[PDB]
Structure 1
Amino acid sequence: GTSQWLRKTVDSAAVILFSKTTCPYCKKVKDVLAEAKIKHATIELDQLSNGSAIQKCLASFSKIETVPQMFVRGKFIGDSQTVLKYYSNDELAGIVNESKYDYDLIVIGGGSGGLAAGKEAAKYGAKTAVLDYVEPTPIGTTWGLGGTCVNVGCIPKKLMHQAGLLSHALEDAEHFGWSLDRSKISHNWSTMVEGVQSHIGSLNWGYKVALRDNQVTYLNAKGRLISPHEVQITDKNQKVSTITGNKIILATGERPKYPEIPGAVEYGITSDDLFSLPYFPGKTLVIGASYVALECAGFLASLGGDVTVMVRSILLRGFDQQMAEKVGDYMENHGVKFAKLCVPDEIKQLKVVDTENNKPGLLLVKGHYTDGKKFEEEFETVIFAVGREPQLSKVLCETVGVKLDKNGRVVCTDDEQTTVSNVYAIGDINAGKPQLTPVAIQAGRYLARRLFAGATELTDYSNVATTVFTPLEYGACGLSEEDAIEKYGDKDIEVYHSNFKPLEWTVAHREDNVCYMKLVCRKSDNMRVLGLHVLGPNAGEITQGYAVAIKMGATKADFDRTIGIHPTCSETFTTLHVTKKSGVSPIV
């Protein structure tokens, strides 16, 4: 075990120092490297249980069993006197810069995963380049550094969600004694967009500054992997060049899909366009039933939009379907219209977007319900949210030897390795992984640490918590009820559940018995919590802490023993008692 680990660590690390905490010579080297501004990984052997065995194994690489020992790109470069010799002769900078390739790491993609990986690698002295390019949407929308989440995803989505929530805070205010004339209050889409875009702008800038401060080379360039170590780059002027890298991280993410219908690409928009849209969507049709579809429909309705969601089959496929129905029901009860069992056939333009008064155009949507009745209705904006897709034909040459699955995603090992051994893939393009920002970030940081700092820790992709930021939010961690039943059998599953009502909703005169939570548990495994689900306000804040407990293997008894904080929504998880099998009502 130790021999394998040390071999991999020496082979892969860009600059690494083997040391001990109580070592005066190790400190001398550390001080020299710090003065010379040489970043590096450090392994303190006296902080590892196999540290003595590691010390002895180092002689297979250096011929010595003492500390300190410094390595650069797979080669022992010296002990304490040797490093200080390089230093006094002005040879040290040259030695630590010596490389077969232009970079130790090239990251293709400057999004959630790629930026996380690139910054983390640079910390340990890996010579790093991050490439980012944003291919314009069909209408021409583009954006700056940071990826999907920062520019056209989690960040602007949640900010618009908040603008939506404030709509209802305005109503609630009156019941709590605030005197205001709601009939004279309106929302300005464009003002909201400007505020959101200003914040996104500060993030674009912040990431650029961060890369500079970490000595990462940032290239606003389209990258193409043409061989295992060669990346072809195309800049803004269309000038083509080649750079070389030892390790390659593919982190190019996905883009929205369009349905294959006449008028879709020409007249429809996606989430890519929505978050910087210069005009008010107005009367909107959202085609799709993904978490993106419902989130966007939701905030658009709360901002006073006339909103219809066209649903082919079900909502939130892959999510707990009881919870998905509850999410949909709340939206429907609050004005979101659902065109159920309906598919679109054709989109026709009736009016072009007014680019001077910033007003939407007008569209005619033609379709049909499964019952054969025709759908024909005018909408000012049509948004497609029918899923997202990798675009690796734009990123990798087929002769490189990176294997993709049927969906065009990269087939990876549990340490993100592709079929090309120096090439790794993280984030949304990694086949089978939850497609979320903190997952991409964790994967990128953990990978960079394994590659360049001798870490062993893999990213745990199991029981990753999620939150859907619909008008009433839905948080989950672990298995849906249906998945747990399929896996373990109905007889081995117990479900504890309850409705609840936020205290805030009482004076506000909001719904009884709408907010809902459940714990899906395994009877034969000490009532192990397999899945946690909550529909309610601040569901992400509620859910997060429980994800740690679930990771640790929480049982129903652990929940029972723990005391609630009052008054909160979350405390309801501490006193659950009604089982589904008992048939008792979950109402309170």
Structure 2
Amino acid sequence: GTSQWLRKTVDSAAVILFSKTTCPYCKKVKDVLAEAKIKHATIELDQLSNGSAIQKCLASFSKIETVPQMFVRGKFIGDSQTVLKYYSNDELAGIVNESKYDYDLIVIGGGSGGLAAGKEAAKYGAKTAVLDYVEPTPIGTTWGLGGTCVNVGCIPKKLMHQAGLLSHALEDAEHFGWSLDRSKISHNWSTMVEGVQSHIGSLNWGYKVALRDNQVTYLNAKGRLISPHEVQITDKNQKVSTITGNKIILATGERPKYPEIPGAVEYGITSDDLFSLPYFPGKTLVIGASYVALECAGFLASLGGDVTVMVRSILLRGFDQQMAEKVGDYMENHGVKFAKLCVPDEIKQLKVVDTENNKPGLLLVKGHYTDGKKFEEEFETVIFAVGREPQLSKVLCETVGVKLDKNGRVVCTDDEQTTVSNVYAIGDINAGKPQLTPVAIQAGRYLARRLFAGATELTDYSNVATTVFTPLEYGACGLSEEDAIEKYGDKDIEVYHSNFKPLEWTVAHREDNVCYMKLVCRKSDNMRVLGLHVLGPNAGEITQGYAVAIKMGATKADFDRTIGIHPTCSETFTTLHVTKKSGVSPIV
């Protein structure tokens, strides 16, 4: 029925006021709470489908059925008159604060997900604390509040991606009539890092202010869940203590892996160090083949660097592989070299990194190909991008009872709840969910609404669009081609595709048939669009809008009746017609 909704809501909420929009008694109580600097959620019963039933079940707690009723942490406080009797007796503050625990919510991890959840939580009166600590890299790198996206992920790579795109702007400017000469222009890595770190510092500080100004307690300490309500924190001065919270949210992210080979941890770096490195990396070897490894080799080339990528097997494993190879074939034609079907054996240090004069060392990389041929080349820097993983042993005592899948990730129900009942996990460590910063923000905000404001909304994790920020960007939404065929069979899958050329690339004398797009649709379902794929500039801005249509179950008919915006790259989606089965060429 409706009853157990109301028991969960009243039991979980901190300060909550069942109210009416038109009732003047309720309105005077609200303004009392505002003047009292008392935050709370407000369930206005007159704008819900069955508010009349909810007033009936309110009597199951309060022996009354009128409005307003105020509750604090499961307890019925009183009706109108009762609460202002507390106010002009000055007993209100004592009763709204009193609680079995120190906090209504402890969040372990101050990243995209945790900070999102704590800021939405304190909005509804939940007494909240948020914990964040950055264990240093093996060479000692460190950064402030915000998470992986803010300090060592989406933010600084797209800015470094942007510095690389700008090199083609300088090339293109001549053909559009600008007097400059691209041949006479070099890049300065340190000036870039300083501007990138300046914007990161603004984000760091701005998060501390958001927490300060929302009544969230920020603790720069490493917390560890020892029991289902108990968190054991460690100071900057290694000082250890214990706080307690009613509800706990785990959101501590992942960190870079290294291969188990000698020299790796000692002499190489990872993405965590690349964004604040104080010297240009020089001649660089990137080991791996995920979006991290391509994106970084991507801009490192565009800034004049001598870049090699060492690929064990395939590029972008798990993405559509036609597009993967189109991505990779572009980078190879524009500077990035690849050593295909090759794997590393050890790293020898020939020269130490020169802190004083600000210059890299010199390394020797020993490898072998699959056939058995041997690799051996000198490199000034070696970056490892061979995956990321959580380390929940540092965060979670075995004995508390939280179930971990075979990767170390947290098994949650579809509302983010662990096996222990009052503990939840969001973000990269939620098992089998897409590891993206906008996902972690939605899970975090939609969970806080459910805990402290009686919400029902769940996070939808399906058909979440992505974009890979390689020199030519690749945005995608939905299934890949190979996956659609495997799920429904080659006969039932029809693919529309077509090359294109940006107008902007005409005067600039760029390639005619590298930019490509395709719609993978299902025949026996009115040609429903299953996945969408585009390789070209601004692929992120192109793809986004269609993510809404695809959540709404778009079909090829819907794309055909929508008119294009001319001249854009994106309008090519509105008039696709060549089918893969037909065999007709997709060139311009």
Q: Same fold (TM over 0.5)?
A: yes
- Give the drift of 1:58: 1.1
The alpha carbon displacement at 1:184 in A equals 2.2
Tell me whether 301-310 or 58-67 shows the greater mean CA deviation: 58-67
Rounded to whole Å, the distance in 2 between the matches of 1:354 and 1:566 is: 54
Provide structure 1 residue ranges, at least 5 long, that are not aligned to the other structure.
Answer: none
3-state SS in 1 of match to 2:141: coil
Residue aligned with 2:269, SS: coil
Residue aligning to 1:392: 392
- What is the percentage of aligned positions where both structures have the same residue? 100
**Partner Cα distance (2:2, 2:332) in 1:** 59
Matches within 5 A, 1:494-513: 494-513=494-513
- Conserved? CA contact 2:563–2:574, under 8 Å: yes
Structure-2 separation of matches of 1:399 and 1:139:
33
Aligned twin of 2:383: 383
List per-residue Cα deviations over 1:413-452 (Å, max 9, x = no partner): 0000000110000000000000000000000000000001
Q: Does 1:518 align with 2:502?
A: no
Could you report, residue by residue, the CA deviation over 1:532-565 in whole angstroms, capped at 9, with x for unpaired residues? 1111101010011100110111111111111111
CA apart distance, 1:23: 1.4
Moved more, 516-525 or 350-359: 350-359
Distance, in Å, in 1 between the alignment partners of 2:521 and 2:238 is: 57
- Map Cα deviations across residues 150-195 of structure 1 (whole Å, 9 max, x no partner): 0000000100000000011110111111111223211011110000
- SS of 2:448's partner is helix
CA distance in 1, matches of 2:300, 2:245: 45
* SS of 1:140 mapped into structure 2: coil
Q: Residue 186 of structure 1 aligns to a residue in which SS? A: coil
CA displacement 1:189-209 (0-9 Å, x = unmatched): 111000000000000000000
Map of 1:470 onto structure 2:
470
Q: Kindly provide the CA deviation profile for residues 460-517 of structure 1, in whole angstroms up to 9, marking residues without a partner as x.
A: 0000000100000010111011111111111111111111111111111111111111
The CA distance in 2 between the partners of 1:405 and 1:218, in whole Å, is 30
Counterpart for residue 409 of structure 1: 409
Distance of 1:223 and 1:367 partners within structure 2? 40
Counterpart-to-counterpart distance in 2, 1:55 and 1:502: 61
Q: Which moved more, 1:202-211 or 1:14-23?
A: 14-23
* 1:52, distance to aligned residue in structure 2 (A): 1.2
Measured after TM superposition, the shift of residue 522 of structure 1 is 1.0
Deviation at 1:401, TM superposition (A): 0.1
Deviations 1:329-376 (A, max 9, x none): 111110101110000000011111111222111110000011111100
Using the TM superposition, give the Cα deviation of residue 4 of structure 1 relative to its aligned residue in structure 2, in angstroms.
2.3
Q: Name the stretch that deviates more: 461-470 or 46-55.
A: 46-55
How far 1:50 moved relative to its partner? Answer: 1.5
Q: Is the 8 A contact 2:174 2:181 kept in 1?
A: no
Give the corresponding residue for 1:97: 97
2:293 is aligned with 1:311 = no
17-26 vs 417-426, which moves further? 17-26
Shift of 1:262: 0.2
Which of 353-362 and 514-523 deviates more? 353-362
CA distance in 1 between partners of 2:161 and 2:299 (Å): 5
| Farther-moved stretch of structure 1 (108-117 vs 553-562) | 553-562
- How far apart are residue 89 of structure 1 and its match? 1.0
- Partner residue in 2 for 1:65: 65
Once the two structures are TM-superposed, the CA of residue 87 in structure 1 deviates from its matched residue by: 1.2
Q: CA deviation at 1:12?
A: 0.9
Q: Please say which of residues 17-26 and 386-395 is displaced more in the overlay.
A: 17-26
Counterpart position of 1:440: 440
Once the two structures are superposed, the pairs formed by residues 234-245 of structure 1 within 5 Å of their partners are 234-245=234-245
How big is the shift at 1:46? 1.3
List per-residue Cα deviations over 1:272-309 (Å, max 9, x = no partner): 00000001011110000010000000000001111111
Q: Which residue of 2 aligns with 1:453?
A: 453
TM-superposed CA distance for 1:93, in Å, is: 1.1
The DSSP-based 3-state class of the residue aligned with 1:246 is: strand
Quote how far apart the aligned CAs of 1:253 are.
0.1
CA RMSD of aligned residues (A): 0.7
Separation in 2, partners of 1:62, 1:120: 28
Work out the CA distance in 1 between the residues paired with 2:168 and 2:85. 69
Q: Is 1:291 equivalent to 2:294 in the alignment?
A: no
SS in 2 for 1:499: strand
Q: Quote how far apart the aligned CAs of 1:139 are.
A: 0.4
Distance 2:138 2:21 in 1: 57
Q: Whole-Å Cα distance in 2 between the matches of residues 304 and 25 of structure 1? A: 70
How much has 1:116 moved relative to structure 2?
A: 0.1
CA distance in 1, matches of 2:433, 2:362: 39
Q: Where do residues 564-579 of structure 1 align in structure 2 (5 Å cutoff)?
A: 564-579=564-579
Q: Deviations over 1:32-82 (max 9, x none)?
A: 111111111111111111211111111112222111111111111111111
SS of the equivalent of 2:525 reads coil
- Write the distance in 2 (CA, Å) between the matches of 1:327 and 1:53: 58
Quote the residue 2:373 is aligned against. Answer: 373
Distance 2:357 2:505 in 1: 39
- Deviation of 1:310 (Å): 0.6
Secondary structure of 2:223's counterpart equals: strand
Separation in 2, partners of 1:545, 1:2: 37
> With structure 1 as the length reference, what TM-score do the two structures score?
0.99
Q: Classify the secondary structure of the residue corresponding to 1:179.
A: coil
Whether the 8 Å contact between 2:137 and 2:272 is mirrored in structure 1 is yes
CA–CA distance in structure 2, aligned partners of residues 490 and 85 of structure 1: 73
SS in 1 for 2:470: coil
Counterpart Cα distance in 1 of 2:5 and 2:484: 37
Q: Which moved more, 1:150-159 or 1:46-55?
A: 46-55
Partner SS state of residue 383, structure 1: strand
The CA distance in 2 between the partners of 1:358 and 1:512, in whole Å, is 43
For residue 505 of structure 2, give the secondary structure of its aligned residue in structure 1.
helix
Q: How does 1:112-511 map to 2 (within 5 A)?
A: 112-511=112-511
SS at match of 2:282: coil
Separation of aligned partners in 2, 1:61 and 1:582: 68
- Flag structure 2 segments of 5+ consecutive residues without an equivalent: none
Distance in 2 (alpha carbons) for counterparts of 1:83 and 1:466: 51
Number of matched pairs: 588
CA distance in 2, matches of 1:170, 1:341: 35
- Contact (CA 8 Å) 2:254, 2:391: kept in 1 or not? yes
Give the Cα–Cα distance (whole angstroms) in 2 for the partners of residues 12 and 193 of structure 1. Answer: 46
Look up the SS of the partner of 1:440 in the other structure. Answer: helix
3-state SS of paired residue (1:386): coil
The CA distance in 1 between the partners of 2:79 and 2:435, in whole Å, is: 45
Distance of 1:519 and 1:93 partners within structure 2: 59
1:114, distance to aligned residue in structure 2 (A): 0.3
CA distance in 2, matches of 1:578, 1:73: 62
Distance in structure 1 (CA, Å) of the matches to 2:62 and 2:196: 55
Structure 2 contact 152–271 (Cα < 8 Å) conserved? yes
CA separation in 2, counterparts of 1:22 and 1:65? 17
**Secondary structure of the corresponding residue to residue 58 of structure 1:** helix
Counterpart of 1:494 in 2: which secondary structure? strand
Q: Is 2:23 the counterpart of 1:33?
A: no
Does the 8 Å contact 2:130/2:217 carry over to 1? yes
1:112-159 deviation per Cα after TM superposition (whole angstroms, max 9, x unaligned): 000000100000000000000000000000000000000000000100
CA distance in 2, matches of 1:19, 1:183: 70
